[PDB]
Amino acid sequence: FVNQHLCGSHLVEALYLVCGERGFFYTPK
Amino acid sequence: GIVEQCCTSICSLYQLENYCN
Ligand SMILES: [Cl-]
Ligand SMILES: [Zn+2]
């Protein structure tokens, strides 16, 4: 795996892939 | 937060795991 810049909907897409069934929270500043 | 972490600078898929429930 590698690092990357993830913004807007792309960050949320990544969270979905990584967390899947666990669910996640998305809480911007 | 996550936005500072991953959008402004870069982040790993492992850091993202911190935000799983
Ligand atoms: Cl884009
Ligand atoms: Zn895009």
From Swiss-Prot, chain A:
Domain of life: Eukaryota
Coiled coil: none
Protein known as: Insulin B chain
Lineage: Eukaryota, Metazoa, Chordata, Craniata, Vertebrata
Annotated gene: INS
Residues of the full protein shown: 25 to 53 of 110
